[PDB]
Amino acid sequence: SRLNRESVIDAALELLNETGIDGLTTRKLAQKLGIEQPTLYWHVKNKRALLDALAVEILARHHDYSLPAAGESWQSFLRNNAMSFRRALLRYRDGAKVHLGTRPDEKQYDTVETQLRFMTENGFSLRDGLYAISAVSHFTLGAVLEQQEHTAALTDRPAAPDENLPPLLREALQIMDSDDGEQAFLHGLESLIRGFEVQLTALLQIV
């Protein structure tokens, strides 16, 4: 089939969503694309180049709150941005894994620059605005990775018996699987945002 960048990425995303990050092999991508391996290598050099492109395209497709609205508070922007990032990551199996360790792509420069500027315009030093943005990113990636991997593990083997659990852990387990992770994520997200606020408003006051 077509091997423009768009369609290679399309197929890799499909493959990703079907078989997870382990399924993204040269061989399996070539088979999905209906091609021989040397054909694929002309287009895609290695798994890393593919993973980097997927990380970019997952956000291009499904990360729909990447810039602050007019007059938006930094708090509200981090909240909306985090929700959007999470949704984009959850779209595809192992999409959080695919993002890990990437650095913004040239295609994302204007966006991330605007994010960083926006933070600074709201009183954060570049460093502290970056640490806030990093923390939101890290938290969200962790939350998503734990949710997606847990679902994958369920499919492999069952949890161990309930009746040997201590009681708080037993409740906690009910709670965690009472949903897909959203409630815990949103609660943690508010904690994070408020802690950034405490740090910021403190200025040079001990806090």
Ligand X SMILES: Cc1c2c(c(O)c3c(O)cccc13)C(=O)[C@]1(O)C(=O)C(C(N)=O)=C(O)[C@@H](N(C)C)[C@@H]1C2
Query: Binding residue per annotation — 63?
Result: yes
Selection from a second copy, Cl ion, ligand X, none that 59 binds (CB < 5 to 8 A by kind) is ligand X
Q: Cβ 47 to Cl ion, closest distance in Å?
A: 20
Phi-psi label, residue 101: left if phi above 0, alpha if psi -120 to 50, beta otherwise: left
Residues 7-46 that bind a second copy (CB under 8 A): 22, 46
Q: Which residues contribute to the site for ligand X (CB under 6 A)?
A: 59, 63, 66, 81, 85, 103-104, 108, 111-112, 115-116, 133, 136-137, 172-173, 176
In which element (H, E) is residue 33 found?
A: helix 26-33
Supply 24's token pair: 């993204």
**Stretch of 3-11, 110-118, 133-141, 155-163 lying at the interface with Cl ion (CB under 5 A):** 3-11
Supply 187's token pair: 């609660």
What's the Cα-to-Cα distance from 87 to each of 41, 91, 200, rounded to whole Å?
A: 31, 6, 28
CB 16 within 8 A of CB 47: no
- Which residue, 65 or 188, is less far from a second copy as judged by CB? 188
CB 28 within 8 A of CB 19: yes
**CA atoms of 67 and 77, how far apart (whole Å):** 8
Residues 73-102 that bind Cl ion (CB under 5 A): 73, 76
Q: Cβ 30 to ligand X, closest distance in Å?
A: 29
Residues 104-133 that bind a second copy (CB under 8 A): 104, 106, 109-110, 112-113, 116-117, 120, 126-128, 130-132
The one-letter amino acid at 132: A
Query: Binding residue per annotation — 99?
Result: yes
Q: Which residues are annotated as a binding site?
A: 63, 81, 99
